[PDB]
mmCIF file of C-alpha atoms in Angstrom:
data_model
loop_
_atom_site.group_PDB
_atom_site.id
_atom_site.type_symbol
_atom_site.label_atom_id
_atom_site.label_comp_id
_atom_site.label_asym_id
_atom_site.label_seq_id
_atom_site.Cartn_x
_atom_site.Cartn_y
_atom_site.Cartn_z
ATOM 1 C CA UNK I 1 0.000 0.000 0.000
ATOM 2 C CA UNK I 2 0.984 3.803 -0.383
ATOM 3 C CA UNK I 3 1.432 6.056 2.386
ATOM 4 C CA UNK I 4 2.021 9.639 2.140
ATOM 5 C CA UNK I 5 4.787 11.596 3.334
ATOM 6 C CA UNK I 6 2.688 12.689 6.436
ATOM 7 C CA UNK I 7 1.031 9.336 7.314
ATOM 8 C CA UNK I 8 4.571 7.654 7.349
ATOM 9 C CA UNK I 9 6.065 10.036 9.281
ATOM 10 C CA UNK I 10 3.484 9.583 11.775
ATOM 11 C CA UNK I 11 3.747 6.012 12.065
ATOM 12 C CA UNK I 12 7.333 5.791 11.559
ATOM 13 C CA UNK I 13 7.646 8.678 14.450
ATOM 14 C CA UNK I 14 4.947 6.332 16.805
ATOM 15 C CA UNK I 15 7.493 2.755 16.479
ATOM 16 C CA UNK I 16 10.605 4.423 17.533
ATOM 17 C CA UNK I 17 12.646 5.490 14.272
ATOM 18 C CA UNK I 18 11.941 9.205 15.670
ATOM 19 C CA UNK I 19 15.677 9.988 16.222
ATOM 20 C CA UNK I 20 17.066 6.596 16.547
ATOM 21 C CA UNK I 21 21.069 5.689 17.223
ATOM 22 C CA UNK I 22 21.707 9.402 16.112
ATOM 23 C CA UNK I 23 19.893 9.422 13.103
ATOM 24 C CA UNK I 24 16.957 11.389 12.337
ATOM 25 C CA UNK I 25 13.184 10.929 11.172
ATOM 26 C CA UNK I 26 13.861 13.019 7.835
ATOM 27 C CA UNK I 27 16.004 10.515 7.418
ATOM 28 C CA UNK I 28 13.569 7.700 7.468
ATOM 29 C CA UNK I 29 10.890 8.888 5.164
ATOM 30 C CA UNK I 30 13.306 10.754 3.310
ATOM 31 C CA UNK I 31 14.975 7.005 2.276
ATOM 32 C CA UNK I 32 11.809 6.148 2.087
ATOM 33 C CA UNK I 33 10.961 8.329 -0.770
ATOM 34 C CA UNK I 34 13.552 7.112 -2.936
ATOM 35 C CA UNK I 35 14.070 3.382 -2.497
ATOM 36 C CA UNK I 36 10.722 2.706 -2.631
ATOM 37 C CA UNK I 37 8.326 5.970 -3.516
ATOM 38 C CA UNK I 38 6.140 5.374 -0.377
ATOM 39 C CA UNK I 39 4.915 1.718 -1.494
ATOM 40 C CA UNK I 40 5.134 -1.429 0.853
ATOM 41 C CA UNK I 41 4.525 -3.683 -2.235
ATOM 42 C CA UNK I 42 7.708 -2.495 -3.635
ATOM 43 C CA UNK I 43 9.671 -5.315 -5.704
ATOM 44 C CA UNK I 44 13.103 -4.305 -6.377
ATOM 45 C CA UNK I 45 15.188 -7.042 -7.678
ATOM 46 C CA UNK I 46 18.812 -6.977 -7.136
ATOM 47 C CA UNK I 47 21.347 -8.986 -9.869
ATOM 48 C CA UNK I 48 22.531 -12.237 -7.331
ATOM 49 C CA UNK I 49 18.445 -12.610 -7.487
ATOM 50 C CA UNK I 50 18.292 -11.375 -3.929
ATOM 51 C CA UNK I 51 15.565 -8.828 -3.495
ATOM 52 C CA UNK I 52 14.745 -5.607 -1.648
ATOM 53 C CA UNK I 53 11.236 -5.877 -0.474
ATOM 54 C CA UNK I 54 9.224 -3.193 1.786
ATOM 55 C CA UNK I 55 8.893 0.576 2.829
ATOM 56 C CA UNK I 56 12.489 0.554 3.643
ATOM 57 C CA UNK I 57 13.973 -1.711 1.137
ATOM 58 C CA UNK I 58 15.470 -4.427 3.178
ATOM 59 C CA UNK I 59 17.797 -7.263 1.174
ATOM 60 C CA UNK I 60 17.025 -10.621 1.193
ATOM 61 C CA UNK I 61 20.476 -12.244 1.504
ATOM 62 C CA UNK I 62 21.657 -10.442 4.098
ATOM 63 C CA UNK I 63 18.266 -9.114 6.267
ATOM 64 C CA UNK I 64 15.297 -11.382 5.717
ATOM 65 C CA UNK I 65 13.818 -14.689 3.951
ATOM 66 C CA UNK I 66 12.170 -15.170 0.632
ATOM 67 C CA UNK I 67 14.037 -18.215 -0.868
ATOM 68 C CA UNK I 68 15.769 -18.016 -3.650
ATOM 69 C CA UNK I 69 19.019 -16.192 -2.597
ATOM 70 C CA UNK I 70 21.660 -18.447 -2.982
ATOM 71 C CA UNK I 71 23.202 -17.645 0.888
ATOM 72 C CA UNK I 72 20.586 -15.276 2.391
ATOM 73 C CA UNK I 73 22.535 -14.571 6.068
ATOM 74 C CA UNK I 74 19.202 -13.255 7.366
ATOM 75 C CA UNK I 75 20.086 -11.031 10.305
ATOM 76 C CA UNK I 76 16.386 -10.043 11.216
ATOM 77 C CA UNK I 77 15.508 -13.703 11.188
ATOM 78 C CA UNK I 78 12.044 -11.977 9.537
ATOM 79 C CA UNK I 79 10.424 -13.467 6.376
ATOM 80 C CA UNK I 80 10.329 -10.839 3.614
ATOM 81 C CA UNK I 81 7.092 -11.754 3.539
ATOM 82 C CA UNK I 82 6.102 -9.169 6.389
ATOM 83 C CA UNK I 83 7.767 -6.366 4.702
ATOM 84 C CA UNK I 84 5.599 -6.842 1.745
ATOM 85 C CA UNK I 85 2.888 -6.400 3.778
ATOM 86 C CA UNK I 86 1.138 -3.488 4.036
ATOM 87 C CA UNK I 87 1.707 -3.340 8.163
ATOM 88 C CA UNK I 88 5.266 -0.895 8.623
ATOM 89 C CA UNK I 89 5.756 -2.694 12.258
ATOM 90 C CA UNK I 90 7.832 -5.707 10.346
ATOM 91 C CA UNK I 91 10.452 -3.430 8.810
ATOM 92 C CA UNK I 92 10.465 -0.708 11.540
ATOM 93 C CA UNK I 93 12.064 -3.575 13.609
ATOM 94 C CA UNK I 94 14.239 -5.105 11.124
ATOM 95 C CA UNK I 95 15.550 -1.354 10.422
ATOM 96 C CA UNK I 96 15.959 -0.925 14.075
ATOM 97 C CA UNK I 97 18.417 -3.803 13.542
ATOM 98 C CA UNK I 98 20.173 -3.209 9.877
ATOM 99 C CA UNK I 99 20.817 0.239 10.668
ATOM 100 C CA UNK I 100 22.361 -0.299 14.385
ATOM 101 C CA UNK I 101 24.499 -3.685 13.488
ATOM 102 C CA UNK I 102 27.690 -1.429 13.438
ATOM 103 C CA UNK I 103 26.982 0.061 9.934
ATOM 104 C CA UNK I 104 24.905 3.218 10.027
ATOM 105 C CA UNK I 105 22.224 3.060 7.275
ATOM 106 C CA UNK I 106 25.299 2.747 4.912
ATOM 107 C CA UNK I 107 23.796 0.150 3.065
ATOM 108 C CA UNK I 108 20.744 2.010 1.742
ATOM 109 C CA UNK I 109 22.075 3.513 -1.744
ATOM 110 C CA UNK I 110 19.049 6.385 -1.311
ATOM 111 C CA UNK I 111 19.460 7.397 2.113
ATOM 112 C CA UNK I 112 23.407 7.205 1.690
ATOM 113 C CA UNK I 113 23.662 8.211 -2.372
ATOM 114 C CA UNK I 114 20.279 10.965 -1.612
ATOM 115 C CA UNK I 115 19.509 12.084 1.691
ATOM 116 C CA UNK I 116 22.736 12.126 3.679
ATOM 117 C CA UNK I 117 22.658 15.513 5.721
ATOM 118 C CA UNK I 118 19.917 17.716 3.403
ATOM 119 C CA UNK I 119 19.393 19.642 7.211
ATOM 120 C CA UNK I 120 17.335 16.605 8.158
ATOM 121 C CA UNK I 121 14.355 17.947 9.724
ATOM 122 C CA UNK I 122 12.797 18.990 6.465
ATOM 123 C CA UNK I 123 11.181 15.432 5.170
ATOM 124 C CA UNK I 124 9.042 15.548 8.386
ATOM 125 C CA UNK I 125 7.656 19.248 8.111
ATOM 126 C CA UNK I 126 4.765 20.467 6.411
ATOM 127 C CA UNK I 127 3.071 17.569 8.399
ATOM 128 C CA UNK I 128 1.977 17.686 11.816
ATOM 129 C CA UNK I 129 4.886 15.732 13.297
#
């Protein structure tokens, strides 16, 4: 399903992403608007055949489970299933996890290649907050 920048940002802001391990809600929704344009439903099929399923894009081989990914390390030890799914809850845990493994969202080619430092707040104003 499609959110909207507002909804998002309100239920993204009510799970805990809301300034999480230093790193902002702009940041959230604003990755959100260019991995996936707001859509849970959204396919995104990397070359190994691994895929990128959800709101948030999560990988298969290395996050969650969909079978066929030759190797998929699953860290979330989610099925991708959930992210595909028009509930947020599945992948605003998973991204709890991803992002805070070490890292930093450094694996999102969006929020790192897009919205790394645009004065963060701005993704999450307009709305009510």
């Amino acid at each position: 399903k499609v959110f909207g920048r507002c909804e998002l940002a309100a239920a993204m802001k009510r799970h805990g992403l809301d300034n999480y391990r230093g790193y902002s809600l702009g940041n959230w929704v604003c990755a959100a608007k260019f991995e996936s344009n707001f859509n849970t439903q959204a396919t995104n099929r990397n070359t190994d055949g691994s895929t990128d399923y959800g709101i948030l894009q999560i990988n298969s081989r290395w996050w969650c489970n969909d079978g066929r990914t030759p190797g998929s390390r699953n860290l979330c030890n989610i099925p991708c299933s959930a992210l595909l799914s028009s509930d947020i809850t599945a992948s605003v845990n998973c991204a709890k996890k991803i992002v805070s493994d070490g890292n930093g969202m450094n694996a999102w080619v969006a929020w790192r290649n897009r919205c790394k430092g645009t004065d963060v707040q701005a993704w999450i104003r307009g709305c009510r907050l």
